[PDB]
Design a protein around this ligand. Sequence first.
Ligand SMILES: NC(=O)C1=CN([C@@H]2O[C@H](COP(=O)(O)OP(=O)(O)OC[C@H]3O[C@@H](n4cnc5c(N)ncnc54)[C@H](O)[C@@H]3O)[C@@H](O)[C@H]2O)C=CC1
Ligand SMILES: Cc1cc2nc3c(=O)[nH]c(=O)nc-3n(C[C@H](O)[C@H](O)[C@H](O)COP(=O)(O)O)c2cc1C
Ligand code: SF4
Ligand code: SF4
Ligand code: SF4
Ligand code: FES
Ligand code: FES
Ligand SMILES: [K+]
Lengths: 44, 213, 263, 430
Amino acid sequence: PFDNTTYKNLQHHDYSTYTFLDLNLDLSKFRMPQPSSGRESPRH
Amino acid sequence: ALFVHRDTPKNNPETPFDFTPENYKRIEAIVKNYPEGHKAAAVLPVLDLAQRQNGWLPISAMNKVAEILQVPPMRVYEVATFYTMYNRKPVGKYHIQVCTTTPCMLRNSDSILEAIQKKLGIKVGETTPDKLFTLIEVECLGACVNAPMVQINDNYYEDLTPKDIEEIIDELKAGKIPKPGPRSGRFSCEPAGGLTSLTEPPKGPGFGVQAGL
Amino acid sequence: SNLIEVFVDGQSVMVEPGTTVLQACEKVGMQIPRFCYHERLSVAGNCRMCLVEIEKAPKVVAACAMPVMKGWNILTNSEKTKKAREGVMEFLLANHPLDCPICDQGGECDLQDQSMMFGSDRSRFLEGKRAVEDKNIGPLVKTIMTRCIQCTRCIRFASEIAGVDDLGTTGRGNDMQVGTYIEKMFMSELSGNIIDICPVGALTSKPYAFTARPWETRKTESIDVMDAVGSNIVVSTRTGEVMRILPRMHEDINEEWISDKTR
Amino acid sequence: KTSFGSLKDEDRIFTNLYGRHDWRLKGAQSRGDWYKTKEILLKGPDWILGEVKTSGLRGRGGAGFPTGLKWSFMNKPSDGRPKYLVVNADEGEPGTCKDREIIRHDPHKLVEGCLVGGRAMGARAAYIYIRGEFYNEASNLQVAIREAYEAGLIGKNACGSGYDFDVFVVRGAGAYICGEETALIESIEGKQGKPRLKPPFPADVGVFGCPTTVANVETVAVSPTICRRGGAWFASFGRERNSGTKLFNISGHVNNPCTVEEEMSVPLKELIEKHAGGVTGGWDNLLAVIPGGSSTPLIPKSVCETVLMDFDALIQAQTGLGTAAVIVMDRSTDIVKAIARLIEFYKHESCGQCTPCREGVDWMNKVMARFVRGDARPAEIDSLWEISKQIEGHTICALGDGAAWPVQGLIRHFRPELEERMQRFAQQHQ
Ligand SMILES: NC(=O)C1=CN([C@@H]2O[C@H](COP(=O)(O)OP(=O)(O)OC[C@H]3O[C@@H](n4cnc5c(N)ncnc54)[C@H](O)[C@@H]3O)[C@@H](O)[C@H]2O)C=CC1
Ligand SMILES: Cc1cc2nc3c(=O)[nH]c(=O)nc-3n(C[C@H](O)[C@H](O)[C@H](O)COP(=O)(O)O)c2cc1C
Ligand code: SF4
Ligand code: SF4
Ligand code: SF4
Ligand code: FES
Ligand code: FES
Ligand SMILES: [K+]
């Protein structure tokens, strides 16, 4: 069927105060290894 | 409102603050996004995490973020006093942000601000004595066609009448959670007198694709 | 040699690839008015006083930061360059306090001198000025932060030379304040040299404070004896009494700094 | 083509702009997104740059810089530093609410845009600097990025093309100046949102000192549609060097304030009367229009009759396109209160780095707060004009320009209204 009268974006009603950070914690296992600048910090 | 710190008993470097261990896993997830040698770039999420744990930033979260990221504490003081979200004073649980810039002042968000002020008995910047509602007045929040709109801690409440925001405050006082959307007859941002566009079905895969692709 | 040819007021000069506009004007004996550029600190570019016109280019460039490209005619005394300098000096003198009599920097102030040289001669600011809370950063530095023009030589000195990383800019906009944000006492071994580089009288010398005035001082170029580095100093006296000790430039010892014990 | 406007629904780039369809992966692949992505990635950076240059795509961020010519600065060999496509998703401009709609409702179009753009410029990852106020939109985009990783579309071996590409989302913290590209770079680096100076451009020294292209949500999301549909298709709409479609946010005093995708050179009267139903009280009730958000100077009712809503025809009207955010202000509006509130926005949102903005924007807000009451003499209008000319072009970024421009527009188009304001103040208080 085709719908044009309902708003299918109802997920944001259930987001808590840690949804973004839990999603980042979920996505931390899919990522490529970060490059290194030859040091620990620019004060090292 | 002030951008210096005075060591009150409830706000000092001896004020208790430490992340929960799941928040330490979250800070690991934040720091692992940025390249090696630029760990300092994880100031702004982690410090916002240190606001989402406590509700506000005493000066121990600034010191803790400077301690776990090994950056100078002044470089976190600059971030906490530069950005308008890092509440350095204890706000209420429902931090109400009323947008009254020009596209919302044209659509009379002053009536909504007056309604919230007479409903809560407070004014802009003050806090209700039960420490539920903090009413301040902010700049453009990015819902300009959905003007006039307010923000409650994560949520946008849009196309508001004074009656609508009185209804939202009523269903916030009793402990319930409202629906973060436009309170008029439209759904997100469409023309209120019906869809003037995108009524046709989207075609799907393969439509209009050039050859050699 | 890969030296390139640029033009300052039409005068040809041969510079290095990577030379800024300010050094390109320095090579012909010209000095651009500046507040945040310091030749031993990093380039900030946040006072906009060094704005100079490149011809056939409808926008003034920041001479402290902008490297020269091959063939620029750097117009230093043009019309829109002087309008840029007068406008930026007007904005620096909008919220600045009328403290020139009670200020120790009077007579040795950059802001007074290049307001007299490069700015206008009167005012338009018919409003109320800001007033900034004074900071406590030590027994050596008297801090009157209403005079701070927010040029960030504090931060660049404490971060790059003194290596302290404890000064900064809190706030945002016309409420932005250079300070420490807490009751912290800025005590390094070079914590008095911030009195030198501050172009205004925001950071004055607290032992020197209110005693003297630089036009009636006599300069005597002497040597430090406090350490075995041999810092070139000026003993500046007044009527047979040593008022203070300024640094001297020497590229092989103390480049233009001295320790706090020396000062 | 001579006439412009009345764009068909089949030629829209942002289908599911209104949230009526599923924003997720099964919804996005049912609307043409993530289709033949591997065949776009395998044909090289040069083919994608040629498609974007041939399309006539300009900067949808607001300056209108040529997007293919912008992205071709990054097509240069490595030097040990990685490269980064960084999506400017702040959108703090008043009147402008379109990138909120793109992130909230068409996120996979933005993710495929990050992938095709990062292939086009050799970039390694994607940093979507989303606004901190857009929290639910950020979690929305993170769910879509999870659906893009778990389907094997991005990450290690993106779409099976041998190309590796990550996508990050960095939330902001409530600063309008962090929408400027260099201040956005400075905000991602864990510092204050203070803009860098140009040159170094971000294509040489950008985020973390890497080569970087900071690009708008719109000009990133439309680029896989440009690569699939063609360059000549996207170039056919609008005028020449004003090619394509554009999102328009009609807000203010209209009957139906709304976001709508529309052809580039559409007339303003046709746009407001069709998609917004016209001005409240009819078109004769119109007083002024800020055409493209707060940075652009306003135009009166005498200019809105024949003006076209692209870059060049608004530059001919001595204003700008900018973000294509039509703020409509009818006859019931104190325009001086609105522009003084707009200068109050530009002094509450200004990072305080360099002199003319930090001092003069507060000083223009004080002079405009007196112009609202009329507590001045008319020689302070022209004075204020000079103050704008002492800010416009003498600052680091274009927020000093974006604050000098509305004062100039208000003076230039309603000088006598300010003068009669001040004279009735002067007679009623003396
Ligand atoms: N979309 C939004 O939310 C907002 C948009 N704006 C608009 O943004 C514009 C101001 O942005 P700016 O970045 O200050 O202006 P624009 O001159 O700098 O910059 C646009 C792009 O052009 C590139 N560019 C220009 N000349 C270049 C060169 N010679 N070499 C390399 N790259 C070059 C820059 O890298 C930049 O990415 C205005 O039109 C304003 O209306 C302003 C506020 C908010
Ligand atoms: C003060 C200021 C704020 C800006 N804010 C944004 C913004 O929020 N979003 C955006 O896409 N561009 C913004 N811009 C424009 C950017 O400088 C830049 O043109 C754009 O982000 C990327 O260029 P593009 O048009 O090729 O995408 C802003 C510019 C200025 C001067
Ligand atoms: S800092 Fe300079 S301009 Fe300011 S009061 Fe002191 S002498 Fe006068
Ligand atoms: S106190 Fe002086 S040196 Fe420090 S930032 Fe202010 S004007 Fe510059
Ligand atoms: S002019 Fe204003 S917005 Fe720009 S760098 Fe300076 S303080 Fe920032
Ligand atoms: S002006 Fe209120 S949301 Fe943009
Ligand atoms: S000296 Fe170049 S801007 Fe301050
Ligand atoms: K000084």
